[PDB]
Amino acid sequence: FKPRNYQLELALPAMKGKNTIICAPTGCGKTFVSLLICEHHLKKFPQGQKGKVVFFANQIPVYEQQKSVFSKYFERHGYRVTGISGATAENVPVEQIVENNDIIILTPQILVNNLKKGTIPSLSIFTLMIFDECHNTSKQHPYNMIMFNYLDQKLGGSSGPLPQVIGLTASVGVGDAKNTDEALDYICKLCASLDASVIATVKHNLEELEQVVYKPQKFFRKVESRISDKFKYIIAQLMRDTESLAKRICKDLREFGTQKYEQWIVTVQKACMVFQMPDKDEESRICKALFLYTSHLRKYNDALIISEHARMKDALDYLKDFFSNVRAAFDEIEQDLTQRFEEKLQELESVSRDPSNENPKLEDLCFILQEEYHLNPETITILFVKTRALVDALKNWIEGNPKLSFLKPGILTGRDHNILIATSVADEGIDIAQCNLVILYEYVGNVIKMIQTRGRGRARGSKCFLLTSNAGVIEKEQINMYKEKMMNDSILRLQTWDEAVFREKILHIQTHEKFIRDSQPKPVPDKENKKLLCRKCKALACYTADVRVIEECHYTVLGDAFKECFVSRPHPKPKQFSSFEKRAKIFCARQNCSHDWGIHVKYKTFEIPVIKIESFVVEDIATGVQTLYSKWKDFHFEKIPFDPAE
Amino acid sequence: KPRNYQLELALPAMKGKNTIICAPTGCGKTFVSLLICEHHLKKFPQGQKGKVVFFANQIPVYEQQKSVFSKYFERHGYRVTGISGATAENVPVEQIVENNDIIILTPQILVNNLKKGTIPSLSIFTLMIFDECHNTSKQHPYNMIMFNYLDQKLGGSSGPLPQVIGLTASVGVGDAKNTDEALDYICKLCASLDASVIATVKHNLEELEQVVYKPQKFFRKVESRIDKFKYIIAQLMRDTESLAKRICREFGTQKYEQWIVTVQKACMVFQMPDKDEESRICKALFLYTSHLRKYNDALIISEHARMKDALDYLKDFFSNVFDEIEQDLTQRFEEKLQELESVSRDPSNENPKLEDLCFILQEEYHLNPETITILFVKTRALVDALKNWIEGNPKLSFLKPGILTGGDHNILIATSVADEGIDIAQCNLVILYEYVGNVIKMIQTRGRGRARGSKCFLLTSNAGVIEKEQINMYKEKMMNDSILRLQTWDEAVFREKILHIQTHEKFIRDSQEPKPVPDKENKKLLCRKCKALACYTADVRVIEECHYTVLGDAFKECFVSRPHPKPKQFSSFEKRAKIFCARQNCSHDWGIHVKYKTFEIPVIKIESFVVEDIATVQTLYSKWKDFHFEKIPFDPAE
Amino acid sequence: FKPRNYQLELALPAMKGKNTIICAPTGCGKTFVSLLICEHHLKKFPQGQKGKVVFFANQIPVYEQQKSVFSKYFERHGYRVTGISGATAENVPVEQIVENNDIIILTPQILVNNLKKGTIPSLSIFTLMIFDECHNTSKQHPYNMIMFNYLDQKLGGSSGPLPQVIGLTASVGVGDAKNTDEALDYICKLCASLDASVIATVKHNLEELEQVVYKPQKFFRKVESRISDKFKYIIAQLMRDTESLAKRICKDREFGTQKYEQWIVTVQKACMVFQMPDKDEESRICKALFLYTSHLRKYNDALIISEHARMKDALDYLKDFFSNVRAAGFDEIEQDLTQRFEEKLQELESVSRDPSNENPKLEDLCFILQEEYHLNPETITILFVKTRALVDALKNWIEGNPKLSFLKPGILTGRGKASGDHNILIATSVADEGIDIAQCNLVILYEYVGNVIKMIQTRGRGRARGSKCFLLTSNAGVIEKEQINMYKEKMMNDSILRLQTWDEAVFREKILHIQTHEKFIRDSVPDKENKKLLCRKCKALACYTADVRVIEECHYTVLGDAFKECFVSRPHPKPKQFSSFEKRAKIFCARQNCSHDWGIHVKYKTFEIPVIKIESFVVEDIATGVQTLYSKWKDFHFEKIPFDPAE
RNA sequence: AAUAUAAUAGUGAUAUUAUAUUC
RNA sequence: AAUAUAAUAGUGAUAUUAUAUUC
């Protein structure tokens, strides 16, 4: 092929064998850079020797793409390309697969798990490592675990040969740094994490690069929240009523429609779970009632937020679908609350259909769309929003707007079209259709994602609007821009340093961090038998004596006493994780409780339930004390390993 | 030598089309003008010759352009001349224009000469070039010239008209809230210059982008200081207001400034059967409102700068004054005095804005010690304030500040610069301190940042300023898109629309033209401060329809002459002295003393006088044009 | 994914575990059929068992395509996909690579070689085999070798489990059959070769299939040969004068035909064995004769080229030839011949610059292109010709023609010795279906003679409704060949539809019979005295058979520093790595700038060694003196000493 | 080096050339 | 003396102030 000069320039520090973090704008063709570095690396070895390259892709789509491209590129040169992902990782000779292939594409967790398991004895088997989106190397992220192994081998007493390390990123990030010095420290710490002595950027060839990747012009639209809202009043009345019904069965202990009230109502929901009675099949009644109350309050709050960021109709549809899910499941207070909702449904719908009441944010958004599509009818737009509810909401709003009829919206979420509505995309991901219009709707993110989003605006004349009713959002974007300045300046300063000095600084950052990392014990396990009841209906589910732990992670149940406590519905999203294969979802079997207990999976020969401690209440039969645990790791008792021999 | 995009910009003009040339500041528009003029002059046959006039709105640009054109076209058979305010008097401008091929002018010369009748028609020029043509609008001299032009075009004069070439970095969208309105405004501007073509760099854009780089803009939002100082001055405002209230909407805002000015007006129109008693009731209220005003300004300065700057402002004010109620006011000021001073030097209380500014300067100069910085502030008071602040800050010791108002210097503090102006030594750092301006000035300030890597910060605690700047950016988008649309139109249809707009505007312009009958009742001018008898309206003679003088030995009594702080020669006059009231150290500013021809005469402004009259009452007039009486022409015979 | 009904219909017999030959039109999307069959095959097994699929792609582009598609598709299902091609086949644990992967894409030669070595012990390791373009399974083709192994295991007493066999083709072919019954025999024999009991075709869903793949209309253009050859009139004089020069030294049929080519080749081979007591004189006259016959051959080629194309193209062919000759060096004979050619050059270029002489075939072709592009300017054309010389010829003819200016020609050939802007693609031929290229709504066959299979396969370029295919020829036989090929297609479809009606059991019995018969048929002294290897051109001593060593029972090298003085070398124009060898340079005869091609120079393991072909040499027995010529090293019979690194 | 297809010569095993592919 | 820009007040013409320029 025909590489651009800045690509050769970026690859040059790596082709000289130096561990290198390559920092270049999104969409500059880093793929061919990787191909160049890899080709040169593999061809440099004499006849009696051969190298082994490992490419780390953090996402399955990137995994498949890179595997495909590398395979098509290097097959002719006599280099075997393969890959190992979560799907193909089980019951396979991973060591042999690594050994028998020259280029191997991995998702990092495979290498982490296989290093920890011992199947891959050392990283010395690889002569080269490439980290895609290498800014992810930090904290507990798998990249950083791999690099922990690397640095432990390097700084350790007996150290074999180590692979060259090449990172790839659009932005290294400054962290929380408030000034260029702190930024410099963050960047140096990142370089220390990847053992990189060189940061490669485009300097000599800048004009060529700027003819390829163009920087989109960014505008900030500051609008105001709706002052016309009568919907919030009614829904607030409902919230007060339900609060009173919760205040009926309890005694005592800030604003409606905010995050703070969400925290409050969640914590309260937790509080109602620890309350106990001496006659406890009234507990099944009371705590279930309180659970339903707090849940409905939560949903109402969510509706208020949705109405704040979108149409009132979207909030009413949210609630309607919610109460639709309440039915087709005949509860208790549920019919009561449903009726109470239908009381105000007519008034609410009367308010939602009033054109005078419409959201000014959507008005301004519609304005932007209208103008830009009037000037350029061929415009491809991408619209980022915070939550999936907003995705569906703006989908329906665009489809239901006569003004926007020129739009043909589409959906992009987690787990033909003019405009694509999405939540967020981790890092760069696979290149999609170029968008000359990017709209950030109440969006807040870091500097890295800011720089990465520009990659959708690569063409000249691309535009990016940030639309919000909050000033904090805007100034967050601005401090992110300043952060970008600090980043570039700190990098430019580092590049002026002597390579040896930087190597040593990196060395002591590594050594210090390793001392700290080795400095960081074993908690005393309690053998007292507990009871696991339901967080909703407080019904007896398990005893901790019946609970076994599989692979130091998952928890299952043995006794047949549990088989009468649960029902099962076919899993909405069946998938196989590790050695487990998801089959069904598990719910409480008592009196339509239908609380989510966990999943039902196929493990080897056995088919067993797996439960989450997040879904249950802990009962100490000795002290009668009830407590709540978020993660199984925070629950300290005696966990008996799963034994197939029983 | 020529860069392609300059040829591209000059092409529509070279084809004889009236053209608005729109390109980024500092792309070398001068050579574009040179190309256009050269081709225009050399295109004529043997029996004919061209005459080009170049309008520069500012004297530095005037001199620069005159010099460059002179050096360039002397080689060829074309004579280059120029006429500015200094050389415009007692010279046959008609012959000067007639005897030269290229004439560089400040627009007021051509306006005045068109009215005077010395230049009968614009038909004498075959080419006109407006520098910073975005200024052609409203009552600006450019627009006056173009009013003459359009008056000839739409009329039955049927004389030949000059090709019109405008030059600007931004045409502006005006007040437009959307792309359609922007399109309307731009079409009206094209109509004002009678231009059928907007020339911008398109084919060669990538060549233009390696010359002029767009500096990165950051926005710094801080918070206001949290203020015992303000709390102290508040009572001075209150009790001074009580002193005013004894003889007869909050503090620190320009609203209160409006308030105090329009209080002072009413204090000037108060009247009484006696004479003396009002003289110093009005003197008292005058000084009360004045000192109140100065206190207000002091609070504002304390908000935008150090407390020491405000204290120095007040101290200088009280130093410039004396008596008795000045002694009272001063004494009351000396009571708080210190607690002012003691609060001021408390490091605790420092302005966060200045802290953030100092941070910015610190970082940028730490990374690049060779940095050149330019700092824009709203008022001269802030210029001096930040001057002393920079020179008085240990952290800023690397800074060697300088002053630019209306190497040896690392940072240059300025107020504002009209349009692009003459080229300066360019700053890789531009800081806008509480700056609010339009889209045009925004684009023009980029000219200081042409080098790659230049940065521009906008520092404010107001947060409405930020919104203003960003909607200005959106305005730029609207501008470029509207232009991009106009460029796609068919030229004929566009010329038709332009014609319609021209006729429309001329109809409205002719619709607005009054002239009330002059009141012959003899009037009386009093000093606005001390209400002293100053003049009779029958002593006032008018010189050249503009300047008003006074006769009689009686008026020579009433005013004192002091040498002018800034002597300057305007028109046929010469500023020498300054005129003040002679009463009881009132010394209100009445006007100036000038030398006109062989005469030494006083010139007064109606703005400093109040018009009382005998039969009936008083009124105030800001300008002489608003004051209607019988105005007797100045006769050299006394 | 949303599979079409006929794809499920085609995949259904295979999903039932039946060995199946899948016969469907080219471009119906057979890849999805393969994906369905493989997915079902892999997901059918219980927990304690797992399947292993092997896919056979005959060409590297298809190899990479299929590997990519299968990898992208089956990764999410938990099945590892890999491949082994010629490039990656060396110095790798093939057995482990096969064992550790669920789906393996392979070029058949890899499997044949690995079975022959014994690295892969049995075909029992695969539960499913898929042959792409399975009509190639016959004779000595690698597919058929694999199936020889398969059937040897089936008919033997090994009693090991065998994989399900699924073939894929657009046409099974009738072979040489003159009638339907014989066609039935051929098809049955093919089914016996693939051990297939079922032939799957689209029947119920045909109405759906015909809305995807459309049959292009075929037109037959029969034109006239050019009426008068001035060019051949004068060049027959150069052939006559050259064979008269040959007629001086000899002491011992139509021009412009293949008969003359055969004759001049046999003559050239006859001149190499002539011997004299004086060996240097012998070398002189043998070089002379070789050169004469060579120039004769080139002239003949020119005649043919100008028969099928412009006379300018033939003239330029000869000019290119003599350019190369001039580049070779100054030989007395070559200088002479070139001189006599240059004498007639003026007259010649005089005769092809005339517009009057343009051949009727190119005129008719020009008419076709003109009309079709007049009706549809967006037309994409593909032009098939027999030889690469004609590819260059028509390539230059198109852009050298003012009327054809709307055409943007392109070149498609082999490697060896709509939205884009190429409107027309000139090509020689493409093996089987190959990777799908841009759809051509115009297909021009210029003097093309194929078989029924290639005819059916070329329709895949015409899938769109309204596609057209012209057959333009002056021979008048070609028409008949294509027609009888159409009849062959009818015979094929009819015989297939007849076979589908049989009871499957009976068919299995007939198949077993044929297989056993074929196995019965299939199961049915070297000279030790030294020989000399002489140059076929200059008769110079190159090697002795005692110095020749045989590597891997295939390639032949030479030992000793003596041979290093007999040849020169220049870097290989097309460097290529075959097997364990890496091509470096070409070796030529070093004596008096003979420059005859002896072979190649390669890197084998640690060694840098020459490899020679017996085709370029003459074998002289030291004892008898008798000189002989040999086809390939296989037919040369002497005791061949294996290459020993320790020697 | 092997393989396939096509034309030509031969009754045919084959042979020559052309074309393509693979190792 | 004229003019332009910006902020504030007014629904607007305008008005005040700030800044800059020109004759």
Ligand SMILES: *O[C@H]1[C@@H](O)[C@H](n2cnc3c(=O)[nH]c(N)nc32)O[C@@H]1COP(=O)(O)OP(=O)(O)OP(=O)(O)O
């Ligand atoms: O005898 C042959 C053979 O030993 C060796 N050879 C050349 N190419 C190959 C190949 O692709 N595969 C195998 N197994 N063996 C090969 O070369 C000898 C003959 O040399 P050539 O002059 O014919 O080879 P060359 O490269 O010059 O021509 P070509 O291979 O392009 O056709």
Ligand SMILES: *O[C@H]1[C@@H](O)[C@H](n2cnc3c(=O)[nH]c(N)nc32)O[C@@H]1COP(=O)(O)OP(=O)(O)OP(=O)(O)O
């Ligand atoms: O009414 C004005 C006018 O008659 C005269 N005047 C002063 N400067 C100019 C000038 O630049 N151009 C013209 N045409 N006329 C001028 O003075 C009268 C007002 O006197 P001021 O006190 O306001 O002017 P002064 O010089 O004292 O102050 P400043 O103008 O520099 O700020």
Ligand SMILES: [Mg+2]
């Ligand atoms: Mg990169």
Ligand SMILES: [Mg+2]
């Ligand atoms: Mg090697």
Ligand SMILES: [Mg+2]
């Ligand atoms: Mg992890």
Ligand SMILES: [Mg+2]
């Ligand atoms: Mg202006």
Ligand SMILES: [Zn+2]
């Ligand atoms: Zn329950």
Ligand SMILES: [Zn+2]
């Ligand atoms: Zn006075």
Ligand SMILES: [Zn+2]
């Ligand atoms: Zn030789």
